[PDB]
Design an enzyme around this catalytic site. Structure first.
Site, PDB file in Angstrom:
ATOM      1  CG  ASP A  15       3.799  -0.477 -14.917  1.00  0.00           C
ATOM      2  OD1 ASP A  15       4.128   0.645 -15.448  1.00  0.00           O
ATOM      3  OD2 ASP A  15       3.805  -0.676 -13.665  1.00  0.00           O
ATOM      4  NE  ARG A  29       0.987   1.782 -13.727  1.00  0.00           N
ATOM      5  CZ  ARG A  29       0.911   0.607 -13.151  1.00  0.00           C
ATOM      6  NH1 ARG A  29       0.320  -0.382 -13.776  1.00  0.00           N
ATOM      7  NH2 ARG A  29       1.293   0.479 -11.909  1.00  0.00           N
ATOM      8  CG  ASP A  34       3.871  -1.427  -9.196  1.00  0.00           C
ATOM      9  OD1 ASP A  34       3.963  -0.539 -10.014  1.00  0.00           O
ATOM     10  OD2 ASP A  34       4.430  -1.429  -8.070  1.00  0.00           O
ATOM     11  CB  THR A  35       6.687  -3.344 -14.161  1.00  0.00           C
ATOM     12  OG1 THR A  35       6.256  -2.077 -14.649  1.00  0.00           O
ATOM     13  CG2 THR A  35       5.937  -4.423 -14.930  1.00  0.00           C
ATOM     14  CD  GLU A  37       8.418   3.370 -11.543  1.00  0.00           C
ATOM     15  OE1 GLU A  37       8.689   3.888 -12.655  1.00  0.00           O
ATOM     16  OE2 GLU A  37       7.209   3.122 -11.187  1.00  0.00           O
ATOM     17  NE  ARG A  75      -0.392   6.633 -15.451  1.00  0.00           N
ATOM     18  CZ  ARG A  75       0.318   5.935 -14.565  1.00  0.00           C
ATOM     19  NH1 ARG A  75       1.576   5.667 -14.754  1.00  0.00           N
ATOM     20  NH2 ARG A  75      -0.292   5.546 -13.453  1.00  0.00           N
TER      21      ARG A  75
HETATM   22  C1  LIG Z   1      -2.759   0.914 -12.162  1.00  0.00           C
HETATM   23  C2  LIG Z   1      -3.497   2.112 -11.626  1.00  0.00           C
HETATM   24  C3  LIG Z   1      -2.738   3.163 -11.146  1.00  0.00           C
HETATM   25  N1  LIG Z   1      -3.349   4.236 -10.664  1.00  0.00           N
HETATM   26  C4  LIG Z   1      -2.575   5.313 -10.008  1.00  0.00           C
HETATM   27  C5  LIG Z   1      -2.357   5.005  -8.501  1.00  0.00           C
HETATM   28  C6  LIG Z   1      -0.978   5.524  -8.271  1.00  0.00           C
HETATM   29  O1  LIG Z   1      -1.066   6.885  -7.780  1.00  0.00           O
HETATM   30  P1  LIG Z   1       0.246   7.687  -7.219  1.00  0.00           P
HETATM   31  O2  LIG Z   1       0.994   8.250  -8.434  1.00  0.00           O
HETATM   32  O3  LIG Z   1      -0.312   8.793  -6.368  1.00  0.00           O
HETATM   33  O4  LIG Z   1       1.104   6.718  -6.509  1.00  0.00           O
HETATM   34  C7  LIG Z   1      -0.274   5.498  -9.611  1.00  0.00           C
HETATM   35  C8  LIG Z   1       0.691   4.304  -9.723  1.00  0.00           C
HETATM   36  O5  LIG Z   1       1.217   4.271 -11.084  1.00  0.00           O
HETATM   37  P2  LIG Z   1       2.678   3.917 -11.347  1.00  0.00           P
HETATM   38  O6  LIG Z   1       2.894   2.543 -10.792  1.00  0.00           O
HETATM   39  O7  LIG Z   1       2.691   3.969 -12.868  1.00  0.00           O
HETATM   40  O8  LIG Z   1       3.564   4.901 -10.652  1.00  0.00           O
HETATM   41  O9  LIG Z   1      -1.306   5.392 -10.570  1.00  0.00           O
HETATM   42  C9  LIG Z   1      -4.705   4.347 -10.654  1.00  0.00           C
HETATM   43  O10 LIG Z   1      -5.301   5.384 -10.177  1.00  0.00           O
HETATM   44  N2  LIG Z   1      -5.497   3.400 -11.187  1.00  0.00           N
HETATM   45  C10 LIG Z   1      -4.926   2.225 -11.621  1.00  0.00           C
HETATM   46  O11 LIG Z   1      -5.643   1.309 -12.019  1.00  0.00           O
HETATM   47 CA   LIG Z   2       5.369   0.868 -11.872  1.00  0.00          CA
END
Ligand SMILES: Cc1cn([C@H]2C[C@H](OP(=O)(O)O)[C@@H](COP(=O)(O)O)O2)c(=O)[nH]c1=O
Ligand SMILES: [Ca+2]
Length: 129
Positions: A15, A29, A34-35, A37, A75
């Site tokens: 993702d 992103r 959510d994929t 890890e 991102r």
């Molecule tokens: C997809 C997405 C993720 N995020 C943030 C929330 C999550 O915060 P935290 O890092 O505090 O968990 C993180 C999840 O991304 P990843 O799934 O890439 O880890 O990215 C956003 O803020 N907006 C979004 O639309």
């Molecule tokens: Ca992920």
């Protein structure tokens, strides 16, 4: 929403991908998914699926939603299209991502993706198997 040009710089995981947008390198992103890890079950398969989709495309495009265009990590938050096909939806349809991180005001494609997830789950695909 509008599709805008980008070029692949390098695949990262299921993702996230690195692309050049407006001539600058960015990590994107994918919205609404959510994929797993890479170190988790189906993580390598999700990575491989996205990598193939984006690398094989003649063109990629990014489409921002109505809200936040970048997250707290810098991102880009987008829907990514490979020769017109949405990677976010295709991952969900294959059971390689769950619908997730659905924030109000950046959720234009939610129902499209929920429908894909219901189909993946009916077919018992991958994460749903
Ligand atoms: C997809 C997405 C993720 N995020 C943030 C929330 C999550 O915060 P935290 O890092 O505090 O968990 C993180 C999840 O991304 P990843 O799934 O890439 O880890 O990215 C956003 O803020 N907006 C979004 O639309
Ligand atoms: Ca992920």
């Amino acid at each position: 929403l509008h599709k805008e040009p980008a070029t692949l710089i390098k695949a990262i995981d299921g993702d996230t991908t690195k692309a050049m947008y407006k001539g600058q390198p960015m990590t994107f992103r994918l919205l609404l998914v959510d994929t797993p890890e890479f170190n988790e079950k189906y993580g390598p398969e999700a990575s491989a699926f996205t990598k193939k989709m984006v690398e094989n495309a003649k063109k990629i495009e990014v489409e921002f939603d109505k809200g936040q265009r970048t997250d707290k990590y810098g991102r880009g938050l987008a829907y990514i299209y490979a020769d017109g096909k949405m990677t976010n939806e295709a991952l969900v349809r294959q059971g390689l991502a769950k619908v997730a991180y659905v924030y109000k005001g950046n959720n234009t494609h939610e129902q499209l993706l929920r429908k894909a997830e219901a189909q993946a789950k009916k077919e018992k695909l991958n994460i749903w198997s």
